[PDB]
A paper describes a structure:
Here we present a systematic approach to scale up the discovery and characterization of small molecule ligands for the WD40 repeat (WDR) protein family. We applied a DEL-ML hit-finding strategy to 16 WDRs with a range of druggability scores, and two non-WDRs with ligandable PPI domains as reference points. We have previously shown that PWWP38,39 and tandem Tudor domains are druggable. The SETDB1 TTD recognizes lysine methylation and acetylation marks on histone H3,60 and has several reported ligands.
Here we first tested 68 predicted ligands using an FP-based peptide displacement assay. In a displacement assay with FITC-labeled H3K9me2K14Ac, 20 compounds reduced the polarization signal by more than 60% indicating partial displacement. These potential ligands were then tested in dose–response by SPR, where six compounds had KD values ranging from 24 to 200 μM. Using these preliminary data, compounds were selected from Enamine REAL in an attempt to explore the SAR. Further, there appears to be a better fit to the (S)-enantiomer. To confirm this observation, the enantiomers were procured and tested by SPR. MR46747 (the (S)-enantiomer of MR43625) binds with a KD value of 4 μM while the (R)-enantiomer of MR43625 binds with a KD value of 70 μM.
Numbering used by the authors: 1 to 212
Write the structure that this text describes.
Amino acid sequence: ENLYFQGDLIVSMRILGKKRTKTWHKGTLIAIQTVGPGKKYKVKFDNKGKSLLSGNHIAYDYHPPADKLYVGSRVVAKYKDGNQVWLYAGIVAETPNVKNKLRFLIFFDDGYASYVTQSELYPICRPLKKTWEDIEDISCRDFIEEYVTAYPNRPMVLLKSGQLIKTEWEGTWWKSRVEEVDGSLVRILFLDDKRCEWIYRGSTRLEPMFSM
Ligand SMILES: CCN(CC)CCNC(=O)c1cc(NC(=O)N2CC[C@H](N(CC)CC)C2)ccc1Cl
């Protein structure tokens, strides 16, 4: 059956859709198609392509009120590294409080983390009941299930700017320096290639966490 309405979705609404690159892109909802007890959502992307997508692979083109977002909420967020932006899927790890300077902490599906504002967050339209169950990487999937279900029980390691530690990359340990602390995140400089990454202080990418 072709529908025009399904829950709070309406054909012709602006939407975000997931592409095979795992990045999300602006489009229009052009059809809703019931297949058994299941629904599929046809997206015409603004730039290139049309996709028939499951409800967990579309996101609203508007920002969710903070009162609707919990630890474990399934979102698309802007990830910024200061020479590239992505719209990428993740999980809300913290909601705004005085300690995080009123920001949302996002754990992205690829294991990277960022603080973002509400204007950088888009709720996924039909998430799974267990929101982590559509994360591709088994390791990121298991870590999110543990973090979300055990929250607010959160082991983190305490680190100071200048501190010299081992940080993981591609399954080995690398010499690195703690540059900066910003709430539950630490900026690590890899001394080998002078590349910086923001890492969650509870991540076992940090050798002090991996052994704690
Ligand atoms: C949700 C966000 N997603 C969206 C997909 C992107 C996250 N970001 C990256 O994935 C990214 C990470 C690197 N990091 C490195 O290449 N390295 C770190 C140090 C390491 N070297 C090797 C000699 C020393 C140990 C190399 C580079 C570029 C990108 Cl874009």
